[PDB]
Amino acid sequence: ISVRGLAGVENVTELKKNFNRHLHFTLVKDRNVATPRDYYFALAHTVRDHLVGRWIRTQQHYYEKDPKRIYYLSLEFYMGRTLQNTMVNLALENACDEATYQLGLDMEELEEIEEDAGLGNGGLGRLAACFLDSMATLGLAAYGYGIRYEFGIFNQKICGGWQMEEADDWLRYGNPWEKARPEFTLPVHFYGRVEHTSQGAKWVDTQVVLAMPYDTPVPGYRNNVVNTMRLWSAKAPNDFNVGYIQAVLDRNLAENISRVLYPNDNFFEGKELRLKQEYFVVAATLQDIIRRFKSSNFDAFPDKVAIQLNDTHPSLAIPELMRVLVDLERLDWDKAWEVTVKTCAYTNHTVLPEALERWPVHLLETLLPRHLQIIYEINQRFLNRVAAAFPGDVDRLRRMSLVEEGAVKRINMAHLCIAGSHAVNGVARIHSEILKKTIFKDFYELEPHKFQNKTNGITPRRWLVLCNPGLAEIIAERIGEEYISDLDQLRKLLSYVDDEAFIRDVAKVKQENKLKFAAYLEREYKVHINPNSLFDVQVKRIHEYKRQLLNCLHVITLYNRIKKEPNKFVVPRTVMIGGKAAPGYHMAKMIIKLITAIGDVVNHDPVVGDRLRVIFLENYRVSLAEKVIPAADLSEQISTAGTEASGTGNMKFMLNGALTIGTMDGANVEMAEEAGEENFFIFGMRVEDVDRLDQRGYNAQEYYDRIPELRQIIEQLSSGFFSPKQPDLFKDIVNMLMHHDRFKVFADYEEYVKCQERVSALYKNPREWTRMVIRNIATSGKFSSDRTIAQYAREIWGVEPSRQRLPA
Amino acid sequence: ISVRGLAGVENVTELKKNFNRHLHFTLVKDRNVATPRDYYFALAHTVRDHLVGRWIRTQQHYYEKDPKRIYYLSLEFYMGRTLQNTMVNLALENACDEATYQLGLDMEELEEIEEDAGLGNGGLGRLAACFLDSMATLGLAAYGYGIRYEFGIFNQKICGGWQMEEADDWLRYGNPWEKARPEFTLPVHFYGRVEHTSQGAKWVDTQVVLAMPYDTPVPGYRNNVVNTMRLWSAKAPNDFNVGYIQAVLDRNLAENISRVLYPNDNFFEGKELRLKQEYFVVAATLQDIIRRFKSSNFDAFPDKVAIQLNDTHPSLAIPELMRVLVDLERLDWDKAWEVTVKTCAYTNHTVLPEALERWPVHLLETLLPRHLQIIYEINQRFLNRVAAAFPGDVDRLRRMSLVEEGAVKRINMAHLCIAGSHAVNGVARIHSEILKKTIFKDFYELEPHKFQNKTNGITPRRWLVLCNPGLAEIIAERIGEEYISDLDQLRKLLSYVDDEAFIRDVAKVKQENKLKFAAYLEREYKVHINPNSLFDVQVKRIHEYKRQLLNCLHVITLYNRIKKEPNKFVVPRTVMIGGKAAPGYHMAKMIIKLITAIGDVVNHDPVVGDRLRVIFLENYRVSLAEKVIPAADLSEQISTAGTEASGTGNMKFMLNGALTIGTMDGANVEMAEEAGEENFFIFGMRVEDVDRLDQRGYNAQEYYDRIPELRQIIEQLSSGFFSPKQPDLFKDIVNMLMHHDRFKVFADYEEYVKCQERVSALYKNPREWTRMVIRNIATSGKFSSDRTIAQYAREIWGVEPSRQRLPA
Ligand SMILES: CN(C)c1ccc(/C=C(\C#N)C(=O)N[C@@H]2O[C@H](CO)[C@@H](O)[C@H](O)[C@H]2O)cc1
Ligand SMILES: CN(C)c1ccc(/C=C(\C#N)C(=O)N[C@@H]2O[C@H](CO)[C@@H](O)[C@H](O)[C@H]2O)cc1
């Protein structure tokens, strides 16, 4: 495979030498005692050595040229594995493959030993990871700042069809990629009280937690640029017998701040420990930013600094920057505010109101008393501007306030972000339009210039070259390698839609990926599947808005049709659903149980045979995405219109040769626009249709009464067909669908089933299926995160990207 | 300095190269950003690389030859710093000095950056460390097993003359010497219950904590032997929203087992967490031992395994070995017991009854229910043997029982150790004799063959070559280098007691050490001392039995004599006292405050001038011992006769050219025997005198009434002379001395003061002082830990030591 790079004689020799050096001196093993894990670590240390010179030279280069620096603040970085990604971006993959082969080792076996860095929940966390790759590839002086969670997203086990959570102890064996920087440790303050002096406000009597940074290299694609991801770890300050012992053990309370990722991406809870995490990353990060700024007045700060807020989770950056500039640097309020607004920009990732951060005032008053005072002052000055622009509009003042009245007074962190940012963006054209028309309509009317769109993207390094080398190679054969850092070049593939050789090659790559994935399932999970079946895949977090339940209704429809006419031909399918449920989300846990319960019936019915299989993919995570997405024929993107801000899984499937069945939601709209609606399986209500249904009121009973196939399914669920031992098991699911369904599952059922029949019809014609796939891959170029980051750079940050290489 | 080794052209070149390699690839720094700490780490990694080949080859050698293995079980390993010790034992010191000098670095400055590994309290912990060095130097297949405490002995700060404790965060910057072995992790069981089956007892429903080993290399002196110290770290097993988050945070409870060293070396407390630490090290260690034994029936176990118990702290080894052999390996009781007794040996380190471990039965019943059943069965069978040997002696049965009756039933762990061991030793001849005559008299009468002496020793690598290279060199000039691994060769120095050159050289080395230490005091602590004064040093943990208070009475006597006759000549003295008090020990904390309070008066009295200085040495630890002991003229070893089991500080001072003022206690007896009583300042009651005084009753008032100089001091203390602001501050000290003094401070006062006058008289004659010093250094050979370990090897473990080198 040419895209995997050169295996030079001298290169392979030096890699074998450095591998043996690390096995002996670093791991303190010989080849007699060494396990596969030791071999993985020797390889990881060998590859890491190639980053170091480029890492030092890149940071030296930024010190000398002093470019504007981009600070990407996120509570989540969903990085996955690093070894293969590093080899790809340094052009070392073939050399390491050869070197390990010559030492009697299978490199693909060693790659499987690495733990995922699971420091995120899903889309928001994975976007941050794709963005770091694109910022390095585009030569931006960019730093990712976050928390080094000791425990990432939980490992999912399925026991009796139920999700169980296990701690993700990802640092158990060590992390060869990070470098502890205990020398750059910074203090973070909590609690205390404000006293007003002659000189101004002073925040006193605080408790201190130390923020210790760990730096991870972020290599650009073959440009010798290595940027930094700096993650903060919480450390206690060093300040009778049981009393002395207990004081040492109580250090754990401070260190708990960085212990564990909150897994509730569905529902904001308002936990004190989460607020501590948010302030911890903000306070440590801003001291680091200001230190770097002063090391080569504050008028130039926005010319040298951009802070990008990944949702409201780091929104305390706005009042913390005001606190430092006013209280410590003694800038006047108006000058500090000008600097803050020009520095900060905010990205929104959902319109669902239960996910929005609204912190109780009493929590902020106790933990961050000076921040609450600054937020009140921001609010008063903001509402003074609203009053002057819309005189007499007293309801607008209530609606736009950063302070929400009620039983419990709360701060709306989204309102704070809009007030304190020069740019607010959604993550797909339809989402950005919904922000301006609905939830932020009042803010758009006051400051229309702030509101932007930045359609999401995915890195084609991880999401094509790394996970699908077969497809990357047959593309490179025709159009060369330049497309890997310029994905718009895939448009050249439209010239090959009638090329019999290319059609055969695209279909062969998919067949190989499906055999490989079918094998993985048998080996690791003792599961057998028909690799000639259509691979129908829905992988994403379990949320009612994502409508895994609509997919379930289709699966039961196909099962019932087969039982009714057993001797009729149907296109064989393997229906695969995977994703984690948030631990407290009862309905999400019941939906996983329904999927496994359907599998229990369908997969053991002798009349069905190998015509229908339903598999729940356990422990969906970045490493499993890299295996299943290249194997997929059909991508399920079936959110209720107006609920999925963008989606990024959708883009991964498009790039890897799956066709999409989807609603006109999030980026699906732009994907259909790029490929042509004739090359997408689009069904269901548009946003306008959902609004009209809400106006007259959604009555699920009407659909149950009018669609006999739907009635039969509800009767089967209610009566215990899928839970014979426990017949009322799914009553909560039935009750939600019939009486309390916010996401209108029944309203899209008929169009979905009809559209799935059209998928089955096209799959019976392999040549026409593959030609439609080529039209999708060829038009996936817009969905490169390189395009997304170039737009952030030019339209928000005010910096020019570069594909110019640094010297090696 | 020849003893520091060769600086070969090729060696210096390769060290400079590997230093620069580690600075770049390991630390990810260049010489522009590097701090002294980075340079320390580059040097440590460079030196560690030289250990690795020898470490792998040593363990391979033990696998091939399959010698009997020695397992030294200790809750404490007081290791201090590793860098200089490693360079000394590999003969790299001059090469590294040259290499660092050529790179523009001062190696002595880099050595000062290393944290002490403070994993012990004092004598018992430091003995374990000296023993590991001697076992490696004598080519024994020896393993030290302990706990990797996250926090060692607290850092001592003195604030307003009071001890404050700070957490010893010794792993803050990382530990380059250890290698995590997460692959050899073992389970340890707690709580649960015993059920009796047809097959026998089963310990079920337990909570599991994981024991993760970290291995540290232990290099022998220039023999290419590198042994292992394996320390266990506690890890939690991987088994709504607040509930999930709280379950992850509760992992801290399991991990608290290895968090912190108990600092109470004075008084046994009976804390559950301490019992968990003791079982944790025993259970993990014994599984490791049995695994290694089975990897090349149990009849051969005592031929292949020796377990040495460092006091009773790992005594649960006895019932744990019985539990594994009976419950898991299904050996009959009598065979298991035979194997256990032949495997285990016990070392006692004190006769003070408050330090003896007596665990409440209710704690053992809850935590270790199967161990309690095995202890009851051991007790019944042991008391059956006592009854058959001494028929009708019902009081002997009560006295010898492992079970102590009372309000709270307790297990006497010393009784368990004697019953379950083939050898019991004290740590100095007088101590071993006291064990047989008093506290273990009944056990000696039943099994006299078990009772041995092993007089303690110190390693001459750390305690001469490393800390006093000047003295090591002038010795090597005369008698060569062989004495460093054969300390009896120092006897050859008796030939030089009348050699004017050697007298001048010994006196010059002491003067240089005193100037160096006087400089350290000014630099680090802004303290000025007269370097021509007699350096009068008492450094050791603060305990009433050690009688720092008797030293205080002498200091006040000298001060009062000077105030009475200001214009009379007295030999100038710097009186230095240092050591940590256990956090709950109120009297020990008051004694530190008295020493600083005396300093406050004496050091600011213009009439005294530079004739008397009283300094409290803050944060006494192994690194400070290495600085102050070479600087000392007079070693204070003034414990009440019968209380100090051995002492080892005494031996360090003797080897480094200080004269000793001491009681006939512990090893002081053997030191005076070796050197001649005419070359020791021996004073005070012998053990026989203490016994006679106890028989008629100690009345402190009698001494107060008869000694006017003593009355004056007590009046000064009581009246507030040393605490003008708070005149009753020392009332508790006065009340203890007058009414409740277990250690008879007043009874030795007159003889102590008279003996101190004889010290002052000899110090006025430099030539005769130095000749007496030469007679001490020349006869210090017996106090090498190489001699001690050779005796353990031949008389307890049944293995022959070897000075034979392994190939490099
Ligand atoms: C702990 N807490 C209260 C949390 C709240 C929210 C979240 C995460 C999301 C939200 N909202 C998220 O991942 N949104 C997705 O962002 C993708 C990238 O822009 C879109 O492609 C996708 O459409 C969004 O759903 C995580 C934690
Ligand atoms: C937590 N706990 C209850 C503890 C109890 C005791 C100890 C330590 C000692 C005792 N006993 C000790 O260090 N004893 C010394 O052993 C030296 C070497 O043999 C002798 O030279 C010296 O004379 C002993 O005092 C530590 C912890």
Domain assignments of chain A as residue spans, ordered by start: 1-457+785-808, 458-784
DSSP conformation class of B298? G
- Between CA B382 and CA B333 the distance in angstroms is 13
Q: Is B30 annotated as a binding residue?
A: yes
CA-nearest residue, atom 5 of ligand 1: A265
Residues 6+ apart with CB under 8 A from A743: A544, A545, A547, A640, A643
- Between CA A486 and CA A87 the distance in angstroms is 20
Chain A residues within 8 A of B247 when measuring between CB atoms = 167
- Between CA B475 and CA B477 the distance in angstroms is 5
Residues 523-582 of A with CB under 8 A from B: 582
Q: CA of B171: which chain A residue's CA is closest?
A: A182
The residue type found at A528 is H
Q: How open is the CA angle B6-B8-B9, to the nearest 5 degrees? A: 160
- Residue reference for tokens 């006040």: B556
- Secondary element (H or E) of residue B28: none
Nearest to B594 by CA among B130, B96, B162: B162
Residues in chain B: 808
**By the 8 A CB rule, do B369 and B410 touch?**
no
- In chain A, % helix, strand, coil (3-state, to 5) comes to 55, 15, 30
> Which ranges of A526-603 would DSSP assign to H, the alpha helix?
548-564, 586-602
Choose which residue among B78, B124, B134 to substitute to test ligand 2 binding: the one with the highest number of ligand atoms within 8 A of its C-beta: B124
CA distances to A34, B56, B64, B145, B302 from B296, in Å? 19, 18, 10, 20, 14
**By the 8 A CB rule, do A650 and A666 touch?**
yes
Chain A residues within 8 A of B53 when measuring between CB atoms = 24
Read off the tokens for A26.
């670093």
CA torsion through residues A369, A370, A373, A378, sign:
negative
Q: Is A127 in the pocket of ligand 1 (CB under 6 A)?
A: yes
- Residue reference for tokens 């030290």: B144
**By the 8 A CB rule, do A661 and A637 touch?**
yes
Cβ <8 Å between B243 and A583: yes
- Between CA A640 and CA A435 the distance in angstroms is 17
Cβ <8 Å between B241 and A271: yes
- Residue reference for tokens 């006017």: B708
Query: CB neighbours (10 Å) of residue B724?
Result: 12
> Which ranges of B308-360 would DSSP assign to H, the alpha helix?
317-323, 333-343
**By the 8 A CB rule, do B428 and B455 touch?**
yes
Architecture of domain B458-784: 3-Layer(aba) Sandwich (3.40)
The values of phi and psi at residue A113, to 5°, are -80, -30
Name the catalytic one among A541, A547, A580, A611: A541
Q: Hey, what's the torsion of the CAs at A166, A171, A172, A174, to 10 degrees?
A: 160
Query: Where are the strands (E) in A241-362, listed by range?
Result: 305-310, 344-347, 358-360
Residues 6+ apart with CB under 8 A from B586: B732
B1-457+785-808 and B458-784: identical CATH topology: yes
Name the catalytic one among B4, B462, B541, B593: B541
**By the 8 A CB rule, do A239 and A187 touch?**
no
Q: Is A39 in the pocket of ligand 1 (CB under 6 A)?
A: no
**Does residue A540 have an active-site annotation?**
yes
CA distances to A131, A792, B181, B230, B256 from A27, in Å? 33, 43, 10, 16, 28
Q: Is B568 annotated as a binding residue?
A: no
Read off the tokens for A752.
């979905």
Q: CA of A28: which chain B residue's CA is closest?
A: B52
Residues 6+ apart with CB under 8 A from B362: B408, B409
Residues in chain A: 808
Q: Is B230 annotated as a binding residue?
A: no
**By the 8 A CB rule, do B657 and B776 touch?**
yes
Helix pair angle (B83-90, B123-137), 10° resolution: 20
Cβ <8 Å between B238 and A166: yes
Strand, coil or helix: B667: coil
Name the catalytic one among B81, B148, B546, B613: B546
- Between CA B383 and CA B385 the distance in angstroms is 5
**By the 8 A CB rule, do A671 and A680 touch?**
yes
Ligand 2: residues whose CB is within 6 Å? B 121-124, 127, 262, 264-265, 268, 349-350, 355, 427, 456, 644-648, 666
Cβ <8 Å between B183 and A240: no
- Between CA A365 and CA A387 the distance in angstroms is 27
Residues 204-243 of A with CB under 8 A from B: 215, 235-236, 238-243
**By the 8 A CB rule, do B34 and B106 touch?**
no
> Which ranges of B603-748 would DSSP assign to H, the alpha helix?
622-628, 649-655, 668-675, 687-696, 700-706, 708-719, 731-739
**Breaks in chain A (C–N > 2.5 Å) following residue:** 239, 296
Chain B residues within 8 A of A60 when measuring between CB atoms = 30
**By the 8 A CB rule, do B207 and B189 touch?**
yes
DSSP character string of A503-529? HHHHHHHHHHHHHHHHHHHHHHH----
CA distance B38 to chain A (A): 10
**By the 8 A CB rule, do B111 and B768 touch?**
no
CATH of domain A1-457+785-808: 3.40.50.2000
**Does residue B541 have an active-site annotation?**
yes
**Breaks in chain B (C–N > 2.5 Å) following residue:** 239, 296
- Between CA B598 and CA B723 the distance in angstroms is 9
Nearest to A318 by CA among A406, A245, A377, A261: A377
Chain A residues within 8 A of B269 when measuring between CB atoms = 241-242
Residues 6+ apart with CB under 8 A from A96: A15, A43, A46, A47, A87, A107
Nearest to A220 by CA among A412, A30, A102, A90: A90
**Does residue B546 have an active-site annotation?**
yes
CA torsion through residues A102, A103, A109, A110, sign:
negative
Query: CB neighbours (10 Å) of residue B488?
Result: 14
Half-sphere exposure in the Cβ direction for A545 (13 Å, CA): 20
Nearest to A11 by CA among A83, A81, A100: A100
Q: How open is the CA angle A639-A551-A691, to the nearest 5 degrees? A: 35
Q: Rounded to the nearest whole angstrom, what is the distance from the C-alpha of residue B264 to the centroid of ligand 2?
A: 10
Nearest to A236 by CA among A214, A248, A250, A251: A251
Cβ <8 Å between A584 and B244: yes
The residue type found at A502 is F
Q: Hey, what's the torsion of the CAs at A402, A406, A407, A410, to 10 degrees?
A: -10
Chain A residues within 8 A of B29 when measuring between CB atoms = 56
Read off the tokens for A560.
């019932």
- Between CA B501 and CA B514 the distance in angstroms is 20
Nearest to A284 by CA among A135, A125, A73: A73
- Between CA B231 and CA B277 the distance in angstroms is 12
Strand, coil or helix: B508: helix
CA distance A180 to chain B (A): 8
Q: Hey, what's the torsion of the CAs at A658, A664, A669, A672, to 10 degrees?
A: 40
Half-sphere exposure in the Cβ direction for A316 (13 Å, CA): 27
CA distance B134 to chain A (A): 24
Question: Which experimental technique did the depositors report for determining this structure?
Answer: X-ray
Choose which residue among A153, A265, A652 to substitute to test ligand 1 binding: the one with the highest number of ligand atoms within 8 A of its C-beta: A265
Q: Kindly give the pairing relationship between strand A117-119 and strand A77-80.
A: antiparallel
Q: Kindly give the pairing relationship between strand B344-347 and strand B358-360.
A: unpaired
Q: Rounded to the nearest whole angstrom, what is the distance from the C-alpha of residue A594 to the centroid of ligand 1?
A: 25
Strand, coil or helix: B35: coil
Q: Taking the CA atoms of chain B, what radius of gyration do you get in angstroms?
A: 27
Chain B residues within 8 A of A159 when measuring between CB atoms = none
b/e sequence A153-174, b meaning 16+ C-beta within 10 Å: bbbbebeebebebebbbbeebe
Name the catalytic one among A652, A744, A775, A782: A652
**Does residue A775 have an active-site annotation?**
no
Q: Please give the distance of CA A195 from its chain centroid, rounded to a whole number.
A: 42
Residues 6+ apart with CB under 8 A from B406: none
Cβ <8 Å between A52 and B28: yes
- Between CA B409 and CA B358 the distance in angstroms is 9
Q: What is the biggest distance separating any 2 CA atoms in chain B, rounded to whole angstroms? A: 90
Half-sphere exposure in the Cβ direction for B23 (13 Å, CA): 21
Half-sphere exposure in the Cβ direction for A132 (13 Å, CA): 31
A766 inside 8 A of chain B by CB: no
DSSP character string of B186-218? EEEEES-EEEE-SS-EEEES-EEEEEEEEEEEE
- Between CA A369 and CA A367 the distance in angstroms is 6
Q: Hey, what's the torsion of the CAs at A312, A314, A316, A322, to 10 degrees?
A: -110
Strand, coil or helix: B168: coil
Residues 6+ apart with CB under 8 A from B558: B570, B573, B612
- Secondary element (H or E) of residue A73: strand A69-73
Cβ <8 Å between B56 and A167: no
| Pairs from B791-795 (Cβ < 8 Å, separation ≥ 24) | B791/B454, B792/B308, B792/B454, B793/B70, B793/B138, B793/B140, B795/B423, B795/B452, B795/B454
The values of phi and psi at residue A211, to 5°, are -110, 110
Strand, coil or helix: A216: strand
- Between CA B152 and CA B532 the distance in angstroms is 36
Read off the tokens for A494.
């439209």
